């Protein structure tokens, strides 16, 4: 994963040098920037119930046809309503693991490679998860940098589907 | 955000914090005269380093055995110590003067200040000629009517506030007293 | 690894350009931050150069001294200086060149239908 | 050795102060600070900083600390119409440091010109600086 | 690659000198907007997708001509080549907006640019204004109060502002 | 020449990326590493003069014989002398050099690139110059964590000759 | 408009300001032999830097005892401090050339500056080896008597300013005997 | 362009090889199939504005939403209306193209090639454009071998959606 | 060659629009600060005799190899050349900023002349020391902090218009590099 801390390390051993004061300034500014960022994924760990099920509810308000129709890829069913729920639960379990290494390391290995070619083999709609997305960004309730990092790794996952 | 002036304070704790312009007129139609008592506190910061330094000297040249050796102002520590300590006491009327009120100049700077004095031997006649030199100095900036620095500003009356400030130096020569 | 994460669409564009070479347009994909944290960050550097003289020479390891000796370039002056000492032997520029994206040299005997 | 000095505390100090001025809540006071321009962007601000101080400023503040009245002048010969004086006092620094004693090797070291500082390295007067007279092929 | 704190080094190694004092005082200037730099950055980067297909979507309807059949961004492989190039301009930018000089955007992207368009024979005059689309969906991005608190900025939305009509010269 | 900030850039180009939040931490701790590195390179300016044949005189007080051999590379008459008011003021140049940017910049390339080729075919053997700036990192007469920041720079260049 | 100018050396900050062509007429006019005065000052500020390079050298030059371990010249940023109290003097005697007085030099550069080099440890003495190097470096420059530099003039003398700057030099003198 | 031409020279090509009897196999076959093609695509030709608008409208009966939702990416207006009965007059244009070539030559570089860089973009579903297709499958009132071939090049326009 | 005035009907042409209220409002500011730079270019052309005297003798004192017997300014016409190569160059941006468009400078000289530069056996890097020679030289005059000559002109700040002149200048080097 590509944190503050591992790209820091990958750019010694591209030159195969030692650790200089050209990468202790980068985990320096991870350690400022942490303590922002682990009340943020403290909050979003603590209302995690409140913010899957408002969102997976803001989509289909936005898309009443995919609790009514038929077919598989619809949440029409009970077991499609329970695979849109950890869809949701999954991506907001991305932004939290996130914001704890302070980089955009865990959902480039988990979320982001590989999400066009299920998205499209599966027919699922990338503007649903941009809706569940855009409840979460701005219904946590943060307020100021605690907020601003939230919104930078909500924003990142909304500009992969967009 | 009078709150957030003083949770600045109030916390013990070293930050740096600020009022935007949107921000200013919430504070400007609650106090009183803002734009008079936001120049009343420019003109005092901005010779605040100048105002310590005759203070203290006039201090020094009029009564001339503190810096004697034996005396209060030797030992330059002890002289910077001094000079640290009229600092402190021109912070908190500046601050006095921007909350309105004395009451957070009381506790933080003024309590326990009288026999914290003569725990180390500090001639408090001394002190209360000490702050009566800066009690002649914002009286001087306030109404602009300083001998050798003149500022400029908008034209208008500044008594009140030329009153206030010296009604809050007498809170500290009382606490001293 | 053909995803659309996986693709270097500003690599892709240089190559239809004439500006680089299909030399330079393969020492880019070992470089590619792809190749790196799927291919380079799970195994070690003795098994890395398996996959280096494989797939960019076309042949199969000599014996499992030329990984020890190969293996010691990584760690000393890196990865970019790895591919270039090995894009850089005779034996990827007589049969590959500056033009041809490599291939598995001789995977069957001709008369056969099994190979390697 | 440069600053050999570096931690030297001959401050007496009893404890009889802490009843009333705590050890966090010492020599701090609330300074004010005020970006005032007559601009929409003004702000006023105020923060709580320890307060130092030297024992020099009682005739040398630090607002008045190392500020002397510069002058530059433009002037071409005969040029009046054109020509100007300049005065601002900011805080001024000296020139570059003192050499070595230096004895007599190759040339102490300088530094002059306003872009950039230079510095070359004359011996004594002479300024030798890289003309390799050490010159002596063997054919 | 150069920065702000790379010029003068370089500005004064052919030079020979040290860094004068007069010079570091505007360099300590610098990093006090040092932290408005880095939400502004993060103000266009978070929105970088929606830059480029609200600004591509208003030239087309302008330009009717480079859509239709025998257009020059007709095909698909024609149309993401063209959405390709107006997010190439956006990271560039962005890139001399963290960094304090012009010198990474028109090294790396703009050497060359409107040769490259009058050898493919693309319109050069039309590039430039689907990025001065993108500059008025930026700057006018970068002047919101919310997340961050308020205060005069107005030095620093003129430095990204430069930097885009730089490329809107550079294209024709 | 390798600024901390233009590897956050060259570290986002590779990849093909936008700046994430990943090396705009990167570049915070180059702006918190400012001002403790900004009072180093300046100041050092201001006790130069000292410095460059008061460290001379530390190698011909270590080296008698400097002063003493038959040889064009050696500080023996008045002509080498002035080649080294020269050579070791490099070294005192690029660590100033170093902390205007805030890491390992412009001596990465401008000093140590090709430099065994120069030492061994002049034979000048780096016990002198190792000992050229060692009065330097014990006699710059700093304090604090501007003394730590200004020897960040200078026992990467001893480390680079040893 | 020397109100101009001294309200430039009042307000304590940095502060930038320069002179047109109409007020320079209002200068020369106000002032005496102005284009005397004005040359006699432009002799000294363009090779200022030398004279603050050559002056405490040569005060190390006659006392070698600065630069010893224990010495007042030793540790380079004290070093430096001499030659940042080189330099602030230049630039004052300047300005008391340019203003025709001393009034300017007594209150914000001599006051209490005896006090101050006895309370530092600072060699008074040596400085004023130091300043009456001074005192020769600046006659030869408005003379343009200078053995190494000769800068190009008008015709005619400046031996009255010449001796303005003795009596400029001899203040600073007994300021810190 | 692959067509079975272009494809038989190119093997032809690597080998240094004259065209054998293998090579003249593989295009003896395109012209025993050219003929069903190529009354296939003239058939397709003369119908396609019953074919167009036949399968736009299929497509707003089975996705009513599309004609309803707000914004530019869908069927909710006259230009919106528009843009989708020039992008199903898209899709089968180039499926006559492939009738004339013998292969999916002129769908590749045309239409097929960067595709999917334009549907995450402007937000529009591949599922839509199945709907048209299948319209168009078994709608185009063809028989027999003149239906196999226009049948192979529809669903290869499918199977590249999903 | 295109003209800023020019550079808005091409902006209007392709997307077929007529001239809007919007993009007019940048074209009227220019028309009132057009006396500002019309204040500007005659003090670069009448100074320009000094810009070309330092163009060529401040670059040769910083390497004097081209006037060895052998390099490329030794003889007395390619030392008669260099005096003229550059004062062609500033005579074309001076025509460059009253268009205010780069494209007259491309066009004209800046298509080709390192394609020349490598057969003529110059070297790039004598040229962009000696066309930063001349950019500092610019920005000086347009300014009015030159030192030696100082010339008449308004009050006021042309900064935007002083990075336009080191936004030409850059990009003369850069087209020899
Ligand atoms: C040697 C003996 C010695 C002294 C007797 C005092 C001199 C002195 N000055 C002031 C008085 C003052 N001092 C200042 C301060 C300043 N004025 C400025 O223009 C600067 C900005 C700033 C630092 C110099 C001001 C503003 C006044 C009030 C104006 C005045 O009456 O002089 C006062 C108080 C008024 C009074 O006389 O009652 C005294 C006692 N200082 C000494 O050192
Ligand atoms: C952001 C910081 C900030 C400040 C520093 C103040 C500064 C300030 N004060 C006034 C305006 C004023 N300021 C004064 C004050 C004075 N006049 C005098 O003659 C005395 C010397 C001095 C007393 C201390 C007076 C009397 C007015 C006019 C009445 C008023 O508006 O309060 C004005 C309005 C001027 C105008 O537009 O006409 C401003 C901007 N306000 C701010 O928002
Ligand atoms: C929170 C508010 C706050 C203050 C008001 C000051 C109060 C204060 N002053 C001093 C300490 C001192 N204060 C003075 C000051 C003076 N003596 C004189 O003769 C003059 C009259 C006067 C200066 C003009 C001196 C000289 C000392 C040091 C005494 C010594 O160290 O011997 C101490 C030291 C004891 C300790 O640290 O516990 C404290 C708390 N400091 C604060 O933190
Ligand atoms: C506006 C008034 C004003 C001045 C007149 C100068 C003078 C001046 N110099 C120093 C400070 C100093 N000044 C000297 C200078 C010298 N010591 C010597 O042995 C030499 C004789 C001489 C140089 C030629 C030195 C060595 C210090 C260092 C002491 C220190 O840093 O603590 C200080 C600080 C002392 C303190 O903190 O109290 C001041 C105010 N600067 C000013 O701001
Ligand atoms: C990693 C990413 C990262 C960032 C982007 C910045 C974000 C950031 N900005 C501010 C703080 C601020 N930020 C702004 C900025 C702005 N206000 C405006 O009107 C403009 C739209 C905008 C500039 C682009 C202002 C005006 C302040 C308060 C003033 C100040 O910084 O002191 C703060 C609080 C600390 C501080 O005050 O400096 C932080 C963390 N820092 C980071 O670590
Ligand atoms: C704007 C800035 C400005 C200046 C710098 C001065 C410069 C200056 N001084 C004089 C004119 C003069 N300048 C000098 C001065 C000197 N002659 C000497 O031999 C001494 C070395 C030196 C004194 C230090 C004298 C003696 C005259 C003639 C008498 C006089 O006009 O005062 C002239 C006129 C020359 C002439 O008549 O052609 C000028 C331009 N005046 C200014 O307006
Ligand atoms: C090592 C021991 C050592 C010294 C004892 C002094 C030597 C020295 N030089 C001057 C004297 C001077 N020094 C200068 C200064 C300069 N001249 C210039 O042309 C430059 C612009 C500038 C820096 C070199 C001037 C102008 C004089 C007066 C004229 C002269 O005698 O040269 C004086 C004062 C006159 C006197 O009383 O003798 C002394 C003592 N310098 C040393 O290094
Ligand atoms: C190497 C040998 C050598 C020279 C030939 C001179 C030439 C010279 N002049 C200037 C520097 C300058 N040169 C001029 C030009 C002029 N000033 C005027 O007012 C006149 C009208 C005009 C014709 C002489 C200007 C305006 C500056 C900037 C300094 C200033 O006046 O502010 C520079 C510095 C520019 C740079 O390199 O970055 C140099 C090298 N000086 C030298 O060291
Ligand atoms: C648009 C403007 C413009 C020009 C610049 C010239 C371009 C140009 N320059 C030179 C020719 C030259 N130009 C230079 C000048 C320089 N070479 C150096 O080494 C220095 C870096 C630099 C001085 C600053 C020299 C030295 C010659 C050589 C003359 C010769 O070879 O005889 C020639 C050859 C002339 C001939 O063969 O007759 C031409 C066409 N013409 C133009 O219309
Ligand atoms: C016949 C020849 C001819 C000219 C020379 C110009 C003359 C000229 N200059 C300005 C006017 C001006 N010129 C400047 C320019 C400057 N001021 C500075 O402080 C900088 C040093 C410099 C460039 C940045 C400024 C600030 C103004 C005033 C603003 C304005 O009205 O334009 C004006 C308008 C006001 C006036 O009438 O004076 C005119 C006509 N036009 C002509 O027709
Ligand atoms: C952690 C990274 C990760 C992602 C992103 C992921 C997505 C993912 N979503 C899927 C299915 C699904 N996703 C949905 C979701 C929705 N349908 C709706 O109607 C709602 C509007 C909407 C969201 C609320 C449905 C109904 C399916 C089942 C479709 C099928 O099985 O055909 C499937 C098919 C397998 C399955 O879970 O049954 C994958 C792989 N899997 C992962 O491991
Ligand atoms: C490293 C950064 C980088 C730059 C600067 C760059 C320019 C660049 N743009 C190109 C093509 C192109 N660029 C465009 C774009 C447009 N034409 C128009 O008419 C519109 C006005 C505009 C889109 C909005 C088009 C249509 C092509 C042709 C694609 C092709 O022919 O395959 C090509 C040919 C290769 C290709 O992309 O197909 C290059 C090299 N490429 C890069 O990789
Ligand atoms: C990239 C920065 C840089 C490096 C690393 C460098 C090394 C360097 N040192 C040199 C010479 C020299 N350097 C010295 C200095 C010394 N030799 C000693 O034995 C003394 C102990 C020490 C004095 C402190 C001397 C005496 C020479 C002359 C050697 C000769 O020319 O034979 C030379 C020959 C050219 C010259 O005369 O300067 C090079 C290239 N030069 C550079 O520009
Ligand atoms: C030949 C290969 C090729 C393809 C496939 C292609 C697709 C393509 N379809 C587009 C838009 C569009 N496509 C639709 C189509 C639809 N939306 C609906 O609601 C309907 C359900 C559906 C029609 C079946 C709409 C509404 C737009 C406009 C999107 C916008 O304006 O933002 C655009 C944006 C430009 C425009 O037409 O205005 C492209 C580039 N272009 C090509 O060159």
Redesign the interface.
Known sequence: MKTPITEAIATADNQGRFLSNTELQAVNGRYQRATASLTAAKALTGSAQRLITGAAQAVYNKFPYTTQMPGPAYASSAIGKAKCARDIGYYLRMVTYCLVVGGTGPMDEYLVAGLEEINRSFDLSPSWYIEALQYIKNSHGLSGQVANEANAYIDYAINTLS | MLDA?SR??VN?????????????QALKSFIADGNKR?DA??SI??????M??DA??GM?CENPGLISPGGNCYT??R???C??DG??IL??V??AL?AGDASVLED??L???K??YI??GVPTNSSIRAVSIMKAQAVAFITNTAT??KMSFAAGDCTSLASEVASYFDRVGAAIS | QILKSTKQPFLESQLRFNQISIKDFIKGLVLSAPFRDLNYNVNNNYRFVEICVQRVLGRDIYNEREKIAWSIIIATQGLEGFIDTLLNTQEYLSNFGDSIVPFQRRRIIPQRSKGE | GEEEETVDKEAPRPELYNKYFSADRLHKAPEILFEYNKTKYDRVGVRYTEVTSKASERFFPKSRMNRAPVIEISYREGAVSTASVSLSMPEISGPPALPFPVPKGDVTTTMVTDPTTGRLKLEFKVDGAAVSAYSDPRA | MLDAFAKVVAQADARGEFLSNTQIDALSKMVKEGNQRLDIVNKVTSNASAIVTNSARALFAEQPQLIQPGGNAYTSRRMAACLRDMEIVLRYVSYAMIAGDSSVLDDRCLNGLRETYQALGTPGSSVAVAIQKMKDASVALANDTTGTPIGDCSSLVAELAGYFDRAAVSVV
Chains 1, 6, 8 share one sequence.
């Open positions: 002036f600045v304070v013990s704790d070293a930050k740096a914090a600020y009022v935007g312009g949107s921000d200013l936001l506190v420019n910061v901005s010779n605040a380093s100048c310590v330094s203290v000297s020094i330059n520590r002289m910077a110590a000079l640290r600092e402190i912070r908190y500046s601050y921007l933080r700077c309590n326990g200040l026999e914290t725990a180390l050798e620095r």
